[PDB]
A paper describes a structure:
Heparan-α-glucosaminide N-acetyltransferase (HGSNAT), a resident of the lysosomal membrane, catalyzes this essential acetylation reaction by accepting and transferring the acetyl group from cytosolic acetyl-CoA to terminal α-D-glucosamine of HS in the lysosomal lumen. Each polypeptide of HGSNAT has an N-terminal LD followed by 11 TMs that comprise the TMD, which is ensconced in the lysosomal membrane.
We solved the structure of HGSNAT in complex with acetyl-CoA (HGSNAT-ACO complex) to a global resolution of 3.26 Å, with the transmembrane domain (TMD) being better resolved than the luminal domain (LD). TMs 2–5, along with TM10, form a ‘catalytic core’ and enclose the ACOS accessible via the cytosol and lumen along the dimer interface. However, according to the structure, these amino acids are ~34 Å apart making such a bond impossibility in the acetyl-CoA bound HGSNAT conformation reported here.
Residue numbers in the entry:
A (entry chain B), B (entry chain A): 49 to 182, 237 to 635
Write the structure that this text describes.
């Protein structure tokens, strides 16, 4: 018995009905019934036949008995199983009245509760906090980036082998999905904050364009050579290299938004601040040509995804392949993004095993961070640029900045509610990390606005907290990222586990590895070593 | 047919003699005859039986036919085989006179000459040189260390799969063996050069001892955690960790010689220089107490190796195990060093596969850099300290320093000749890297004295060469070492080879990797980034 399983042995007593047991989870959307076990017929009178099977306990189970010769369903039960439990399903015949078939399930051994280590760890963290309590840079931006870094290091090392510290298979939001867009939002803000400071004191655009180009080139080089390939399985060879990647995506969106802001730059007006609703939206109207291009790119993304003809697959398709959507479309994982990507780069230059495979059973390859999602990344980086413009235009009165942050958060939350139709698998556009939906960027940017609204009158102005954890990694992000990608298997971060089937046994190791990375970040702050790409 | 092999098919014509073919290489010392092929008897008249076998071409071959039923040797031939050649051995019966058995060997396909890429590469290097031609630091020490670093990076990546760019199996000296002791000699010199400068300007011994201790601790930590374990094969676990290592050895010898010089330090006498033979050996007589301890440690090493009783093995044994020494002692790879090491640390905490295994066929484990060789490392580091004392005592006249270097080189060369008895496998103490012989340290220190004698009136005084290659890696040694140990499988250094059986195909890749490391060292010099443990 492995993790998230429960031995289910079935006893069948009926004289002459050879039985089939089917299975399907409760979360899987429009999924066919596969097979679990085929119990044998009662060989002799009063000596029932028995079979053994294993059922997953991560989500609820639907179990169907359907016979072998015929189709009439003998029984169905829908129930939820706990980890490492002897459960006993009995199917019998009811003597009273007409002949009837009934199923009774009895627990032999009780299961084991699995959220106890999470509870214990979070109370111990609260107790430790209770014992502990008794060209300027901006503190709030650095604090938020540090929180994103500790979440990324913890989730990428290991979630404790938990399903809610892991990317969802399709059409869902978890703790793991939240981390990546916030980096893009911070990156756009940092673009505006750096660029306004360099253009002042005297500089040339010809000077700055080389810097932008060189940064983009270096990021594209670092991702392909170092981060992507697995160098334990063999020497690197072309026709087997993965070109799409996270650093290439960051580099291309950085190049586009940086050049686009550099072309249309205007000096910041003095005494720009006014009372609320009396500004005349001067921050908005100073960016008049650059909004139009972003609208054209979003119109292109909508039109391409919904209306492009694709051979074999339906023309606009958002669902998974394989078993999902009833196995009518057994390829078509990507849709119109997958066809575009599988006509230019190739099919061998893509990520072989996607997240959707484990539940939806899709054979064909998909890349989470490839082509046609870059447009939405540019849109969200522009939103971060918009936040950065707000901070430097109106920084006389605190009340003004809070009003803009509140209004922007409410309007983005309203559009993401209206598009999502407040569900998970329904609506015009669902929220999905793999396709980089407009709903996805629209819901996480509102959370970023709310988090900045909470932090700014505490960590940055009129201090009530020193923000002491979470800016020490914030200053050095690229060292931490390359460090955990290169040094992942080394001894202080990882060691051999003498029980491989415990959530409890993994969680402490991942927590210690995250704490060690925070300690390394703290040592480098005191030694005043900062590296910037 | 793989590298360094040659297909040898044998034709036997005799009517009734079933034959055995034996094999033994020409370099292997007191080695038994194993089996190569068992050809079958002539089944019919005039229809000879045939067999196929492969013979290695790295060294010469001795081939014996000895029959199966009896013992009378049918024939023997001793010859040298070339790579990838059809050779044809015929054994027949001579009709004339008495019955006689003769063997004739005829070449069907000529072999391929294998030193052509080395010749081509070294002429191309000469042609490139011909095209190219038309608290102070000391330059000569840095230049010598850089040469040692490029040799170490080239040999450790790959020798071109050549036997003379690789450690010898036992009792031998190659290009690969020379690299490591020179680092210890440079290290001892750098100890004296730093220590005399820090004691002047005002300092305390209590201040310096912590620095020495901290450096030793860090080196011991770096070697065990990072350099030794192979982290692709599994997570690290104790009872399977290798404690002996190169960095631990450097750390312990550094601690001993640094503390020993710090205890007995005396200020450098002004106007110490004199005419040759008129100094009264003042450099020698200022170190009077510290010579005695080194003599006691060397006496301990000699007495322990020659006279310690060891169970099962002979009491003082220097030979290999397995097949070597005629298979009389089938264990006893280590001797009295192996027993001492296999009684303290363990047998699981040792290096599993030694260099001697491929030719001598030894099953038992040995560690090249463990316990009881540390004493000789301390002796050679003290010799480097002695060279450093010569440079600062007598640096008024150049002629004086040259006379001391010449005399020291001649006396060490004379002792290493007298001990080695100018042979390879004979003498009282042979030269061996694995046991760290007195002969080994005595012969390489003389070469270090000669190389310093050549470099010092050229690179350091009265320049005729700028030493432009070989000091750029010399300043940063620890970064280069940790860099090639961690980044060994990455793309610019290594790539997939579409022919795996060519010396020519490997050599270019290793040369390019060495040149890239020299380029990285050059970039860091201009950027003025220097790190010191
Ligand atoms: C599921 C997953 O795996 S999610 C994967 C995502 N995780 C990653 O780590 C991806 C890698 N990304 C990164 O490391 C970072 O996002 C970066 C470094 C590439 C960019 O983030 P940035 O905010 O731009 O960082 P960085 O510090 O390099 O910023 C560069 C400039 O911004 C400036 N800056 C940054 N923060 C601030 C601030 N708070 N105030 C003012 N200026 C700032 C810097 O001074 C610098 O300007 P300069 O070079 O002109 O002096
Ligand atoms: C087969 C194989 O694999 S062989 C394996 C061996 N190869 C290796 O790379 C092993 C690793 N060893 C090393 O990297 C080096 O030997 C080291 C760094 C550990 C030590 O070598 P060192 O000569 O001591 O190097 P390093 O530069 O660190 O020397 C430290 C001190 O010497 C001083 N120094 C070094 N060279 C000189 C010089 N020419 N003149 C004056 N001072 C010098 C430095 O200034 C420093 O003094 P400070 O810290 O007080 O300012
Ligand atoms: C089980 O039987 C039901 C009803 O007869 C039928 O609808 C269903 O397709 C069957 N399941 C499978 C997997 O054949
Ligand atoms: C409970 O599980 C164990 C697992 O080995 C099994 O042997 C035992 O038969 C189960 N109990 C019952 C009543 O089946
Ligand atoms: C797509 O589905 C077909 C069956 O309709 C299958 O044969 C094919 O192998 C699938 N594609 C891949 C890449 O496996
Ligand atoms: C081969 O025969 C010779 C002479 O009869 C004998 O000395 C030798 O031991 C034999 N070799 C082997 C391996 O038996
Ligand atoms: C030469 O080598 C080839 C290798 O395939 C072999 O087939 C051929 O028979 C050899 N020549 C002779 C004359 O045996
Ligand atoms: C040492 O030799 C004996 C045979 O004499 C052998 O059984 C043993 O396994 C050898 N040692 C090792 C470690 O293999």
């Amino acid at each position: 018995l492995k993790m998230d399983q429960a031995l289910l042995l079935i006893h069948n007593e009926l004289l002459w009905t050879n039985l089939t047991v089917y299975w399907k989870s409760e979360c899987c959307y429009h999924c066919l019934f596969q097979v679990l076990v085929n119990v044998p017929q009662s060989p002799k009178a009063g000596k029932p036949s028995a079979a053994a099977a294993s059922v997953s306990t991560q989500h609820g189970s639907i179990l169907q008995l359907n016979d072998t010769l015929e189709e009439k369903e003998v029984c169905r039960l829908e129930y939820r199983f706990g980890e490492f439990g002897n459960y006993s399903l009995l199917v019998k015949n009811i003597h009273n009245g007409v002949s009837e078939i009934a199923c009774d399930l009895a627990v032999n051994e009780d299961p084991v509760d699995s959220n106890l280590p999470v509870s214990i760890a979070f109370l111990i963290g609260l107790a430790v906090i209770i014992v502990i309590s008794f060209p300027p840079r901006l503190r709030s931006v650095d604090t938020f980036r540090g929180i994103a870094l500790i979440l990324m290091v913890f989730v990428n090392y290991g979630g404790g082998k938990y399903w809610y510290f892991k990317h969802a298979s399709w059409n869902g939001l978890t703790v793991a999905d939240l981390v990546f867009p916030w980096f893009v939002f911070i990156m756009g803000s940092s673009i505006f904050l750096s660029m306004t400071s360099i253009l002042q004191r005297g500089c040339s655009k010809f000077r700055l364009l080389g810097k932008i180009a060189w940064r983009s080139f270096l990021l594209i080089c670092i991702g392909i050579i170092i981060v992507n390939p697995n160098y334990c399985l063999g020497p690197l060879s072309w026709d087997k290299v993965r070109i799409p990647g996270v650093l290439q995506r960051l580099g291309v969106t950085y190049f586009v938004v940086a050049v686009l802001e550099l072309l249309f730059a205007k000096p910041v007006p003095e005494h720009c601040a006014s009372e609320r609703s009396c500004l005349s939206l001067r921050d908005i109207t100073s960016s008049w040509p650059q909004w139009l291009l972003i609208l054209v790119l979003e119109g292109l993304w909508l039109g391409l995804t919904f209306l492009l003809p694709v051979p074999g697959c339906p023309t606009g398709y958002l669902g998974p392949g394989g078993i999902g959507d009833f196995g009518k479309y057994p390829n078509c994982t990507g849709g119109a993004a997958g066809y575009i990507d599988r006509l230019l780069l190739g099919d061998d230059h893509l990520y072989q095993h996607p997240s959707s495979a484990v539940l939806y059973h899709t054979e064909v390859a998909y890349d989470p961070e490839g082509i046609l999602g870059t447009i939405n990344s540019i849109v969200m980086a522009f939103l971060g640029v918009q936040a950065g413009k707000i901070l430097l235009y109106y920084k006389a009165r605190t009340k003004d900045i809070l009003i803009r942050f509140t209004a922007w958060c409410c309007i983005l939350g309203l559009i993401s509610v209206a598009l999502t139709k407040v569900s998970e698998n329904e609506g015009f556009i669902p929220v999905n990390k793999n396709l980089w939906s407009l709903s996805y960027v629209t819901t996480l940017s509102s959370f970023a606005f709310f988090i900045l609204l909470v932090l700014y009158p505490v960590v940055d102005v009129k201090g009530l907290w020193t923000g002491t954890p979470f800016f020490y990694p914030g200053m050095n992000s690229i060292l931490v990222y390359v460090g955990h990608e290169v040094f992942e298997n080394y001894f202080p971060f990882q060691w051999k586990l003498k029980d491989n089937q415990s959530h409890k046994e993994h969680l402490t190791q991942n927590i210690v590895a995250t704490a060690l990375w925070v300690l390394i970040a703290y040592i480098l702050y005191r030694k005043k070593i900062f590296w910037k790409i």
